[PDB]
């Protein structure tokens, strides 16, 4: 069934996972035309696919041409989503293949369960959780290759770049949340908490600064304080 | 117009004959039902006094032999068994006839109710989703599981119903997954009307035969095979003229005779809204949608 607080570390444990979160996919800015009309015009998008074990990401970009000619696009992108990811199960080796996939979107199931008839040992599952995989693309160095790319490509990435040699996947996992929820509820400020001091920098094979555990801290800290004065801000409370 | 004789009434019971329905006391003097259309397919039925759970009863079509009812104090219920003898039989029905021991088929001239029914209900398709081969009449009641209910346990008591499940391979071609799953045509009229069911009239007739097990023996898994027959045409786009035209008729003729006080169990919401007001279909099924509203517009 759904995945929440109560079976939580169930992600962390040897039993293959992914997270799909499909925010991302389909992606607009909405115009006024010259008649004075609105229109959307797509920028490239992602699939955001993660092994939230192993910090592994799969970042499928989805490349606006995908959308050329296409009706009832927000329907039609939870389909793609489903023949992208299951499409990526099929090219990863048995041993490689998950066990359960977990969407972030409920709209999500029934596309994923359809494409993923051939695979029924592999549960697709939605979650409780209010994940904040949407700001991936606050994320400057994921925002680039998908800015950049000019055709249909698949990128991947660790997400949790050196962390695991150092933390557990829960912690890994805890601290990407916080990072991500921070760069959601106020991207600007999230971004001048990471980046300051000029002497931390990004490793050319990294997506975060590269912090000590100190560091870490400090910074962790700057990002819970930056989510509760937003939050008293929303409600007035 | 033919005769099912009743052996005797040992236990206090609610029969039924189709649509139609008596009571009889313990050990009334009643012998039977006449007056049957030739003609149709036909349901007796029975509820006992004592025990208003287990509706059973039994499909028959007095073109195919001659059967009557006898009560078994053993197995503690109405049997339905053919009579070999024509002479025998016919010599029963005469003397219980003259002694007017008999309940007529209560039919009015003007009402087309039981034919716009079992329109295309055959006993020869019953009796395959019915397996009981040595029988020419078939045995159901309100406990009997389905095939695709089964799946999800004893093989020789289940209703074989066509199984319909729109997450599954026989629904959606490799490659077509979005398009089979929004617009299930392809289903429809290759997989089921043209593989399985061969016609229209075939799918039908299991469509109204589901319908009937549900309404007169509370049959769940019945309930659910006609609501996926019904879902499936109303969800595929490309449906040939004549088939909504009649599933039209049908559906209007099932909602007309449906007890007032059953849509609660018997009508599935969520199937019926997108039936009528969201499937390709919303706009072809004008005299089903305005008996539906009329009758039970809290269900929509």
């Given at each position: 069934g759904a995945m929440n607080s109560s079976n939580y570390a169930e992600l962390f444990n040897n039993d293959i996972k992914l997270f799909v979160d499909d925010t991302n996919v389909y992606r607009v800015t909405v115009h006024k035309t010259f008649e004075g009309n609105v229109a959307t015009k797509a920028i490239n998008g992602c699939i955001f696919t993660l092994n939230p074990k192993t910090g592994h990401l799969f970042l499928k970009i989805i490349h606006t041409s995908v959308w050329a000619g296409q009706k009832r696009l927000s329907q039609l992108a939870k389909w793609k989503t489903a023949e992208e990811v299951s499409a990526l199960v099929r090219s990863l080796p048995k041993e490689e293949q998950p066990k359960q996939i977990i969407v972030t979107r409920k709209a999500m199931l029934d596309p994923l369960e359809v494409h993923m008839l051939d695979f029924p040992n592999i549960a697709i599952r939605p979650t409780e959780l209010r994940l904040p995989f949407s700001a991936a693309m606050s994320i400057d160095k994921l925002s680039d290759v998908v800015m950049k790319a000019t055709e249909p490509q698949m990128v991947l990435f660790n997400?949790?770049?050196?962390?695991?040699?150092?933390?557990?996947?829960?912690?890994?996992?805890?601290?990407?949340?916080?990072?991500?929820?921070?760069?959601?509820?106020?991207?600007?400020?999230?971004?001048?908490?990471?980046?300051?001091?000029?002497?931390?920098?990004?490793?050319?094979?990294?997506?975060?600064?590269?912090?000590?555990?100190?560091?870490?801290?400090?910074?962790?800290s700057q990002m819970r304080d930056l989510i509760l004065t937003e939050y008293g801000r929303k409600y007035n409370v | 117009?033919?005769?099912?004789?009743?052996?005797?009434?040992?236990?206090?019971?609610?029969?039924?004959?189709?649509?139609?329905?008596?009571?009889?006391?313990?050990?009334?003097?009643?012998?039977?039902?006449?007056?049957?259309?030739?003609?149709?397919?036909?349901?007796?039925?029975?509820?006992?006094?004592?025990?208003?759970?287990?509706?059973?009863?039994?499909?028959?079509?007095?073109?195919?032999?001659?059967?009557?009812?006898?009560?078994?104090?053993?197995?503690?219920?109405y049997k339905m068994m053919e009579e070999r003898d024509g002479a025998k039989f016919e010599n029963i029905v005469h003397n219980f006839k003259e002694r007017q021991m008999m309940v007529s088929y209560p039919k009015i001239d003007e009402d087309d109710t039981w034919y716009n029914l079992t329109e295309f209900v055959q006993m020869d398709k019953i009796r395959k989703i019915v397996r009981k081969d040595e029988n020419q009449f078939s045995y159901v009641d309100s406990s009997m599981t389905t095939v695709q209910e089964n799946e999800l346990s004893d093989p020789a008591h289940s209703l074989n119903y066509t199984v319909i499940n729109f997450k599954s391979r026989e629904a959606i071609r490799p490659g077509h997954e979005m398009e089979d799953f929004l617009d299930k045509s392809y289903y429809l009229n290759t997989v089921m009307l043209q593989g399985i069911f061969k016609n229209s009239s075939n799918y039908f007739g299991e469509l109204q035969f589901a319908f009937l097990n549900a309404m007169f023996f509370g049959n769940y898994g019945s309930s659910l095979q006609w609501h996926a027959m019904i879902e499936l045409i109303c969800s595929s786009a490309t449906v040939p003229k004549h088939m909504l035209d009649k599933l039209d008729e049908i559906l209007y003729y099932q909602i007309k005779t449906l007890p007032e006080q059953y849509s609660d169990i018997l009508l599935n919401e969520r199937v019926w809204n997108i039936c009528l007001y969201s499937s390709f279909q919303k706009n072809s099924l004008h005299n089903t949608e305005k008996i539906m509203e009329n009758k039970y517009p809290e269900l929509l």
């Open positions: 997400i949790y770049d050196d962390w695991l040699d150092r933390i557990s996947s829960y912690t890994a996992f805890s601290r990407l949340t916080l990072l991500l929820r921070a760069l959601k509820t106020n991207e600007e400020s999230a971004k001048m908490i990471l980046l300051s001091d000029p002497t931390i920098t990004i490793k050319s094979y990294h997506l975060w600064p590269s912090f000590t555990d100190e560091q870490w801290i400090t910074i962790e | 117009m033919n005769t099912v004789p009743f052996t005797s009434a040992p236990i206090e019971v609610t029969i039924g004959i189709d649509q139609y329905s008596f009571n009889v006391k313990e050990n009334q003097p009643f012998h039977g039902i006449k007056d049957i259309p030739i003609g149709h397919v036909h349901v007796i039925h029975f509820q006992h006094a004592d025990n208003s759970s287990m509706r059973y009863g039994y499909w028959f079509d007095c073109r195919m032999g001659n059967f009557y009812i006898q009560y078994d104090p053993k197995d503690g219920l």
